[PDB]
Design a protein around this ligand. Structure first.
Ligand SMILES: CCCCCCCCCCCCCCCCCC(=O)OC[C@H](COP(=O)([O-])OCC(O)COP(=O)([O-])OC[C@@H](COC(=O)CCCCCCCCCCCCCCCCC)OC(=O)CCCCCCCCCCCCCCCCC)OC(=O)CCCCCCCCCCCCCCCCC
Ligand code: HEA
Ligand code: HEA
Ligand SMILES: CCCCCCCCCCCCCCCC(=O)OC[C@H](COP(=O)(O)OCCN)OC(=O)CCCCCCCCCCCCCCC
Ligand SMILES: CCCCCCCCCCCCCCCC(=O)OC[C@H](COP(=O)(O)OCCN)OC(=O)CCCCCCCCCCCCCCC
Ligand SMILES: CCCCCCCCCCCCCCCC(=O)OC[C@H](COP(=O)(O)OCCN)OC(=O)CCCCCCCCCCCCCCC
Ligand SMILES: CCCCCCCCCCCCCCCC(=O)OC[C@H](COP(=O)(O)OCCN)OC(=O)CCCCCCCCCCCCCCC
Ligand SMILES: CCCCCCCCCCCCCCCC(=O)OC[C@H](COP(=O)(O)OCCN)OC(=O)CCCCCCCCCCCCCCC
Ligand SMILES: CCCCCCCCCCCCCCCC(=O)OC[C@H](COP(=O)(O)OCCN)OC(=O)CCCCCCCCCCCCCCC
Ligand SMILES: CCCCCCCCCCCCCCCC(=O)OC[C@H](COP(=O)(O)OCCN)OC(=O)CCCCCCCCCCCCCCC
Ligand SMILES: CCCCCCCCCCCCCCCC(=O)OC[C@H](COP(=O)(O)OCCN)OC(=O)CCCCCCCCCCCCCCC
Ligand code: CUA
Ligand SMILES: [Ca+2]
Ligand SMILES: [Cu+2]
Ligand SMILES: [Mg+2]
Lengths: 102, 51, 236, 59, 269, 45, 534, 75
């Protein structure tokens, strides 16, 4: 398997637009986070807009939870939360730390 | 040949619905296994005149 | 020369053959410790970090670089220690220019020794049997299951050929501190060589299950000086 | 003569076990079972002497 | 045949054997044989009558097992193409194992002969031993065996072609040729000048050629079973598996005897 | 460029504690007979 | 009831009889090793009153029961007969009546070996039975005959079962499954069946020839007629080594399934695992005389066998690194089967590295009949093959039986055998390097130290076996309750990270073999319409 | 030193030494059967089969020669 990073985003962007129920959105999301890379910000945005279209809020919360496991530092987690600022605000998605604050 | 299906049906021994407790069968079976080396020792030490 | 309580190593060496056996054991254990260090470390640091990994890397199924590399690496290590292991094999098999030959014959629970070089002043065969001292007859200070009623006397700094056979069943002539171990089979004669570099008493045992008395058939060897050996030989 | 087809219909419409369907099978199975019992019991009746070291006096 | 009718027949070709008493009755005869032989070899039983009975019961209990395989294939139709292919493959793995039993007996012969022991005279054969000469009764035997691997070839191909008389005659001749081989070894044995007691030579010689003798008695029993089945119309022109297993047997035993005759008779004498 | 701290510092913080936990386990698996001899009569009288 | 279990032609029912007999035999063989370790606790006569023949008799009985009556009827007779037809889609085995006789000869071979120890004086010879110690001059009476007939009956069993395993794999696979698509456990029973087929007939030649010397006045091995004792050892060891691999490879295939399930990753380099299992099964026929290094063979014979023995370390080390590569980067689930598999990787490596030292003929002069050898083969047979047998039972018995087991009781059982096995066998290397011979009931006084330590660990490990006997009782009486309370593990695979709890209930099982897709106790008619794969 | 014994022989260089004894015994007895019992270098064989060969073996072969049962070819 010789797939460049640019080919990775353009293929999973196409794969999030075709998912037609909850099983499909969760199965595609599982395979996207199972490689040796963190998906690009433009892939995360299409995964949030796919869970809105099937009307499921917990799947959109878990997207950012997996993001904080896969990064290497906590400053890589921050820079994602600063790119996807409008989308998390426009759809009304909270963070798991914000929802169950400790 | 047609047999039955279920939980306690694919084993040769009875575990439920029996008069005697199943503990007498389970631990009696493994006691006899553990006890055959000692029967051999008894016969042979009774042949050497040690007993 | 004698085993000691709670010992975890070779008995002290008296011949160049046992010097070389120990050198090969230590050389091999250098590389078996590198390999055990790797495997135990990879095992430990994989359980401690991936027992807490929530997303498995299910798309990693092969690698061409590592699989070729880890097929070649064990071959280099195996070849490194085969070089001195072949040299020691042919250095111990040679028996060149010995100065005396002794025969040892195994019996149902005793040994037997024969000298037939006819060097003694009267030119006969010197021969005797060796028996373990029974427990009821031991004198205080003697060693249980080791001390015998007669022993084999050899001189120091002399090359010796041993000839070993048996009478009834298989036995085994073995002395740990001399680097000697050879089966004693009814029908054939095997040989071994030795050269002892210091004086003392060296103990051994039978090493081929021979029946009820397999544990009661020890070997005891005394090494003395040359003038002292000729006096012992010329009497017994 | 040829009796494959006739035995073919006897066998395929019978309720009995396979080794009992042939009309002649009684003459083999009755004496075999009696002989099979003697050949199993009798060696077992000799282990008591073997443990006790008693040998038969064929002399 | 619609869906309704196809439902009344199996969906796979493999054979579902009904429960039988024979596998556990053969095991008991095997233990009765083991217990009797050890007890009579050491005097705890007076005579050989109990060993005779245990051999008779091991024999008539395998017959009944073979009798139930005839009925499942001739009267029931349970041997489809897949069942037939599995039976052939199981038999080839059986003979491969039996061939390696002889391979262990050839090791023992060569171990004793290439560097012979000095109590023999350091010579092979040992001193005083008068051996069997090759160009003799053993040369009549190697021709009698080679002559039966070509009369069994034309019987098999006369059955595929539909000729009954020619098929029935080329098997009645293979029978009496293996029978002749068997009694020819009997004559060669009661006349030999040495015995199995005569040291290591009489041990490796009579073991290698004596095992082969026992297989031939089994081989002549197989050709008599085929004779009854071919004469009574069990075997058909395209379905005869009890026959091909016999044919492969007569050819392996032919090659094994060829090896015995070159090593035990020409090289070792 | 790269966001955050160097990968050496991040990996150093995770392995150093594990090296010491490895050497304290393998010492128990291979050195436990040394303790039996410590409390023996044969040792050091 | 009578005809379901005495007339059986079903491969699942027969596999249950195998396991019942296998576990009844490990009781006796463990009791003999306990009597052996009590008599070795201290110098002097301890419990057997100085009867050295009896001590030797119990050592033969110990080895024969553990090998031929526990590990072979359970790993092969049990798991092979139950899981091989289900993993390839077969409706039965080929030859179902052959499959039944291969079990019923083992009970008759046990009432031959047991009556061998009770007659005259028994067989005090070692499990290798070397002549002339085992001939009628040095062992009179019928004891050695009855032990040979017992070995003959186990050879009929293993040979007949091997012929059945080979035909079933080649002929009865389901639609779409080719030989490159077999599960790794099916490959391990297939290769083992070929080693048995080519090594058992050489052992039957050796021990039948030994029976002929004793009773029919024959000189295969007698020295007064020209025979040679060293011939017997060549014939015995040409079966022996292939046997040790007939005992580890089925466990290699079990370890592959367990490690992959509790990592959620497929086996790394799955195709090179089959090539390694075949190379080890082939090189195991070319190395047998490393067991005869001191009997007087030529120096050029000994240099060949050194290099032949060493190169079996290359394919075996490929399987070790491959197993560590599948758990790397995984999602590890530490259930009871996973604990045994991780201990197998650590304790099998140690036992195999002490074999590399033994492989050199120069060093084996200080390693012959030495406890050091006993330490080598109890690390690969008792922390090896035995640990893979526990891993298998905890992996498949809930499905096979329909009954769950107490999980936290099973983790206590694992730690008690891991601690106790190490205490018996680790000091055995210290005794051997200092020079203690094997097969002795009594020793010089300087060996008392480590011999006391090992006898203590023998009590720890027997207590762990008695806890396993109770766990079986609890599973059979309380197995249905173990599913509704929280005392057992229900799913060996948990939901994925982003997979919700209710989506997980659509497909509970994510398996790459058929067996976890059946009903919990599998049906007696498991396939009617054949299974199909792409 | 006054110690001497037989040395390395290229016919028998291996660990197995069975034939070295037996051939020296056989050569010696056929050397005295034609060249007479007394022969200066006929003692070379006599020393070798005495040095490395068991006394019970010689005892058996001597008794066999008396009955004409020695398997070696010496006449
Ligand atoms: C002797 C062998 C036994 C066979 C005959 C015994 C009984 C006779 C039946 C009489 C009744 C009757 O009318 O039958 C007509 C009956 C009519 O049958 P059908 O109309 O075709 O259909 C009936 C059904 O098919 C089925 O027919 P069925 O149900 O009526 O019975 C057929 C047959 C069973 O059919 C079989 O399948 C027979 C297969 C037997 C195989 C023989 C091989 C073993 C013998 C060899 C001995 C030594 C080998 C050792 C190996 C060497 C290793 C050491 O029945 C039995 O034999 C049953 C077992 C006997 C009873 C056991 C208990 C004893 C108490 C009574 O035909 C027969 O008699 C067929 C018998 C089979 C003939 C086999 C020929 C033997 C091979 C030649 C031997 C030469 C070897 C010598 C070597 C040379 C060295 C010098
Ligand atoms: C299968 C192989 C096997 C196993 C498991 C064992 C297990 C043990 N063995 Fe033995 N042993 C041999 C094979 C084995 N051994 C052989 C071949 C010899 C040489 C014979 C010879 O010298 O002639 C030998 C020799 C030998 C000696 C040498 C005696 C002497 O030389 O005279 C000693 C001494 O202590 C010993 C001890 C032990 C001990 C303490 C255990 C115990 O530690 C066992 C520990 C664990 C358990 C208690 C077993 C598990 C219990 C089960 C019933 C499993 C059930 C599992 C399921 C069904 C899922 N063994
Ligand atoms: C399960 C059973 C089993 C297994 C698997 C083995 C495996 C091996 N054995 Fe063993 N053995 C026995 C059971 C077993 N053995 C028994 C029962 C006896 C005594 C019989 C008796 O006398 O009664 C015996 C005795 C025995 C002898 C005879 C010694 C003597 O009697 O004096 C020898 C000789 O070389 C030997 C060597 C080996 C070797 C090299 C392996 C190799 O296969 C091991 C290879 C494995 C590894 C090497 C580990 C992992 C490898 C790597 C991680 C690669 C990297 C390594 C390097 C670069 C070195 N063992
Ligand atoms: C002694 C009691 C007699 C009571 C008197 C009768 C009065 C009425 C009482 C009712 C009880 C009826 C008694 C009938 C006998 C009986 O049910 O249990 C009696 C049975 C004996 O019989 P058995 O058929 O198993 O044969 C065997 C006879 N030798 O013990 C047992 O096997 C206990 C065995 C349990 C241990 C096996 C554990 C294995 C679990 C299966 C796991 C398989 C995993 C497979 C993986 C490949
Ligand atoms: C799995 C098999 C492993 C093989 C191991 C076999 C042994 C190899 C030789 C090891 C030498 C031990 C040093 C002796 C120290 C001593 O001197 O011992 C001293 C005392 C008693 O000594 P003392 O009072 O009698 O006299 C001398 C007084 N000074 O004992 C002890 O402290 C016991 C401590 C045990 C030692 C730990 C062993 C660690 C080695 C790990 C090997 C790993 C295996 C590699 C892969 C196979
Ligand atoms: C389990 C797998 C089997 C492995 C078998 C390996 C070894 C088998 C080799 C021996 C086979 C039998 C030899 C033929 C008999 C013989 O020897 O010929 C007969 C010899 C030759 O006659 P004579 O000596 O009087 O000389 C003739 C001078 N006038 O007389 C004897 O021997 C008498 C002793 C009887 C021998 C019977 C031994 C039976 C035990 C083995 C049974 C067969 C094994 C199983 C076969 C299915
Ligand atoms: C002392 C006691 C010793 C007992 C040993 C007796 C051995 C004598 C040999 C008798 C064989 C009879 C077989 C005929 C059965 C039959 O009917 O086979 C025919 C069947 C039916 O197919 P069909 O083509 O006829 O179809 C008819 C048209 N539709 O096909 C088969 O099953 C093929 C399988 C036959 C294999 C038989 C077993 C051979 C090995 C047994 C070896 C046992 C001893 C081993 C000792 C080392
Ligand atoms: C991987 C598995 C590891 C498991 C750990 C082992 C613990 C399990 C129990 C072991 C049994 C102990 C046998 C004692 C036999 C005896 O009686 O000892 C006797 C000796 C005295 O000797 P004596 O001559 O006076 O005897 C006279 C005979 N009558 O008293 C002792 O030393 C007491 C025991 C010492 C305790 C040590 C236990 C090991 C723990 C290791 C901890 C880590 C150490 C790390 C070192 C770097
Ligand atoms: C001590 C003296 C030595 C005695 C030898 C041991 C005797 C035990 C067996 C007794 C014979 C009874 C007949 C059973 C065989 C049978 O019937 O084979 C017939 C089986 C029946 O197939 P099926 O019914 O299972 O399927 C139902 C389908 N209809 O066809 C096959 O499998 C095909 C392959 C044939 C292979 C047969 C192998 C011969 C078995 C003996 C092997 C012994 C090896 C050790 C050699 C020393
Ligand atoms: C798969 C099948 C594997 C076949 C095994 C063949 C590999 C042989 C390699 C080692 C050969 C060697 O080099 O052997 C050298 C040794 C030399 O012995 P020596 O030192 O006494 O010479 C001293 C000279 N006076 O000859 C042997 O020991 C004989 C071993 C021969 C092997 C026979 C195998 C026959 C198989 C029968 C079983 C069939 C199933
Ligand atoms: C010198 C002897 C070395 C012995 C080492 C033995 C250690 C045993 C422990 C093994 C655990 C690690 C598993 C391997 C990791 C892996 O899975 O590697 C496979 C992955 C998958 O690459 P890919 O398929 O995605 O791309 C296609 C690739 N062709 O590539 C890597 O990661 C590269 C690993 C670096 C190479 C090793 C360098 C060693 C120096
Ligand atoms: Cu002599 Cu053991
Ligand atoms: Ca004691
Ligand atoms: Cu080996
Ligand atoms: Mg030995």
């Amino acid at each position: 398997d010789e797939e460049t990073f640019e080919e990775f985003t353009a293929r999973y962007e196409k794969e999030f637009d075709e998912a037609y129920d909850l099983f499909e959105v969760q199965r595609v999301l599982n395979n996207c986070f199972s490689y040796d890379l963190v998906p690009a910000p433009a892939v995360i945005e299409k995964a949030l807009r796919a869970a809105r279209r099937v009307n499921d809020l917990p799947t959109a919360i878990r997207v950012f939870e997996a993001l904080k496991y896969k990064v290497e530092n906590e400053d890589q987690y921050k820079a994602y939360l600063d790119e996807l600022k409008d989308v998390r605000q426009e759809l009304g998605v909270p963070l798991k730390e914000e929802l169950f604050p400790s | 040949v047609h047999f039955k299906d279920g939980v306690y049906e694919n084993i040769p021994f009875k575990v439920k619905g029996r008069k005697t407790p199943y503990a007498l069968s389970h631990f009696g079976f493994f006691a006899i296994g553990f006890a055959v080396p000692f029967v051999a020792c008894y016969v042979q030490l009774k042949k050497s005149g040690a007993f | 020369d004698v085993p000691t309580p709670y010992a975890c190593y070779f008995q002290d060496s008296a011949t160049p053959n046992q010097e070389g056996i120990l050198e090969l054991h230590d050389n091999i254990m250098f590389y078996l410790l590198v390999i055990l260090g790797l495997v135990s470390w990879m095992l430990y640091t994989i359980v401690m970090t991936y027992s807490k990994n929530p997303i498995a890397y299910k798309y990693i199924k092969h690698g061409q670089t590592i699989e070729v590399i880890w097929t070649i690496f064990p071959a280099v290590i195996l070849l490194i220690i085969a070089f001195p292991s072949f040299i020691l094999l042919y250095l111990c098999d040679e028996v060149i220019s010995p100065a005396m030959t002794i025969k040892a014959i195994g019996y149902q629970w005793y040994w037997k020794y024969e000298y037939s070089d006819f060097i003694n002043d009267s030119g006969e065969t010197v021969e005797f049997e060796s028996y373990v001292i029974p427990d009821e007859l031991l004198e205080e200070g003697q060693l249980r299951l080791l001390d015998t009623d007669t022993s084999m006397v050899v001189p120091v700094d002399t090359h010796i050929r041993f000839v070993v056979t048996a009478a009834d069943v298989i036995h085994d002539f073995a002395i740990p501190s001399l680097g000697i171990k050879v089966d004693a089979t009814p029908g054939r004669l095997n040989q071994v060589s030795a050269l002892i570099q210091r004086e003392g008493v060296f103990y051994g045992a039978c090493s081929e299950l021979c029946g009820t008395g397999h544990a009661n058939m020890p070997i005891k060897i005394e090494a003395v000086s040359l003038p002292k050996f000729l006096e012992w030989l010329n009497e017994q | 003569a040829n009796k494959v087809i006739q035995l073919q219909k006897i066998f395929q419409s019978s309720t009995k076990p396979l080794w009992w369907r042939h009309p002649r099978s009684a003459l083999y199975l009755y004496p075999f079972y009696a002989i099979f019992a003697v050949a199993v019991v009798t060696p077992l009746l000799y282990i008591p002497n073997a443990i006790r070291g008693i040998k038969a006096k064929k002399a | 045949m619609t869906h309704l009718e196809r439902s009344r027949h199996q969906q796979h070709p493999f054979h579902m054997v009904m429960p039988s008493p024979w596998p556990i009755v053969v095991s008991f005869a095997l233990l009765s044989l083991a217990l009797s032989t050890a007890l009579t070899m050491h005097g705890y039983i007076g005579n050989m009558n109990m060993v005779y009975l245990a051999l008779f019961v091991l024999l008539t209990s395998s017959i009944l097992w073979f009798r139930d395989i005839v009925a499942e294939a001739t009267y029931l139709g349970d041997h489809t193409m897949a069942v037939r292919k599995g039976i052939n493959l199981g038999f080839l793995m059986f003979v491969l194992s039996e061939v390696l039993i002889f391979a262990g007996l050839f090791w023992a012969y060569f171990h004793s002969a290439m560097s012979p022991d000095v109590t023999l005279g350091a010579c092979w054969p040992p001193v005083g031993i008068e051996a069997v000469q090759p160009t003799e009764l053993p040369l009549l035997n190697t021709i009698i065996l080679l002559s039966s691997g070509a009369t069994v070839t034309y019987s098999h191909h006369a059955l595929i072609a539909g000729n009954r008389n020619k098929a029935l005659s080329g098997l009645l001749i293979t029978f009496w040729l293996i029978v002749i081989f068997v009694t020819c070894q009997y004559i060669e044995y009661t006349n030999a000048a040495f015995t199995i007691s005569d040291g290591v030579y009489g041990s490796v010689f009579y073991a290698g050629t004596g095992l082969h003798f026992l297989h031939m008695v089994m081989l002549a029993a197989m050709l008599g079973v085929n004779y009854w089945r071919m004469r009574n119309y069990h075997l058909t022109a395209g379905h005869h598996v009890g026959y091909e297993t016999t044919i492969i047997y007569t050819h392996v035993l032919d090659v094994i005897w060829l090896f015995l005759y070159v090593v035990f008779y020409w090289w070792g004498v | 460029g790269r966001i955050g701290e160097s990968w050496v510092i991040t990996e150093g913080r995770r392995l150093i504690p594990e090296i010491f936990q490895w050497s304290a386990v393998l010492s128990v698996c291979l050195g436990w007979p040394g303790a039996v001899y410590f409390f023996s009569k044969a040792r050091k009288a | 009831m009578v005809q379901r279990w005495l007339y059986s032609t079903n491969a699942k029912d027969i596999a249950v009889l195998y396991f019942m007999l296998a576990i009844f035999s490990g009781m006796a063989g463990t009791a003999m090793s306990l009597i052996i370790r009590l008599e070795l606790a201290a110098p002097g006569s301890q419990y057997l009153h100085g009867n050295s023949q009896l001590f030797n008799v119990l050592v033969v009985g110990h080895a024969v029961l553990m090998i031929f009556f526990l590990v072979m009827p359970a790993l092969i007779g049990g798991f092979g007969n139950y899981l091989l037809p289900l993993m390839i889609g077969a409706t039965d085995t080929a030859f179902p009546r052959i499959n039944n006789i291969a079990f019923w000869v083992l009970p008759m071979g046990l009432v031959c070996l047991v009556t061998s120890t009770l007659v005259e004086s028994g067989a005090g010879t070692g499990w290798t039975v070397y002549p002339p110690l085992s001939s009628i001059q040095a062992h009179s009476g019928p004891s050695v005959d009855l032990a040979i007939f017992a070995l003959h009956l186990t050879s009929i069993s293993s040979l007949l079962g091997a012929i059945n395993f080979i035909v079933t794999t080649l002929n009865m696979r389901t639609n779409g499954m080719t030989m490159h698509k077999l599960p790794l456990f099916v490959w391990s029973i297939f290769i083992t069946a070929f080693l048995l087929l080519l090594s058992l007939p050489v052992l039957s030649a050796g021990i039948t020839m030994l029976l002929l010397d004793r009773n029919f006045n024959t000189s295969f091995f007698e020295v007064s007629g020209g025979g040679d004792p060293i011939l017997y050892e060549h014939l015995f060891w040409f079966f022996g080594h292939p046997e040790v691999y007939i005992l580890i490879i089925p466990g290699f295939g079990i370890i592959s399934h367990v490690v992959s399930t509790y990592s959620k990753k497929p086996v790394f380099g799955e195709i090179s695992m089959v090539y390694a299992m075949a190379s080890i099964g082939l090189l195991g026929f070319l190395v047998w005389s490393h067991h005869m290094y001191i009997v007087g063979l030529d120096a050029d014979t000994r240099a060949y066998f050194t290099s032949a023995t060493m190169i079996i370390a290359i394919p075996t080390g490929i399987k070790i690194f491959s197993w560590l590569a599948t758990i790397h980067g995984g999602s590890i689930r530490l259930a009871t089967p996973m604990l045994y598999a991780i201990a197998f990787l650590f304790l099998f490596t140690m036992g195999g590295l002490t074999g590399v030292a033994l492989a050199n003929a120069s060093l084996d002069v200080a390693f012959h009949d030495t406890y050091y050898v006993v330490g080598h083969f109890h690390y690969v047979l008792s922390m090896g093959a035995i640990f893979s047998l526990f891993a298998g039972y905890y992996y498949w018995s809930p499905q096979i039986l329909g009954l769950n087991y107490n999980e936290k009781l099973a983790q206590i059982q694992f730690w008690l055998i891991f601690i106790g096995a190490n205490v018996i066998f680790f000091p055995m290397h210290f005794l051997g390097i200092n020079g203690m011979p094997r097969r002795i009931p009594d020793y010089p006084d300087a060996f008392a130290g480590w011999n006391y330590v090992a006898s203590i660990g023998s009590f720890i490990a027997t207590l762990s076996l008695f806890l396993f006997i109770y766990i079986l009782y609890d599973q059979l009486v309380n197995g249905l309750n173990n599913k509704v309370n929280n005392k057992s593990v229900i799913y060996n695979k948990a939901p994925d990270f982003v997979e919700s709890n209710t989506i997980f209930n659509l497909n509970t099982v994510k398996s790459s073999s058929i067996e976890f897709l059946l009903t919990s106790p599998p049906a007696v008619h498991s396939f009617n319409t054949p299974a199909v794969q792409s | 030193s006054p110690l001497h014994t037989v040395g390395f022989d290229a016919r028998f260089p291996q660990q197995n030494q069975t034939k070295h004894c037996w051939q020296s015994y056989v050569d010696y007895h056929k050397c005295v059967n034609m060249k007479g019992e007394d022969f200066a270098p006929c003692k070379v064989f006599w020393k070798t089969y005495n040095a490395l060969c068991p006394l019970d073996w010689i005892e058996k072969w001597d008794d066999q020669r008396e009955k004409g049962i020695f398997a070696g070819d010496i006449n």
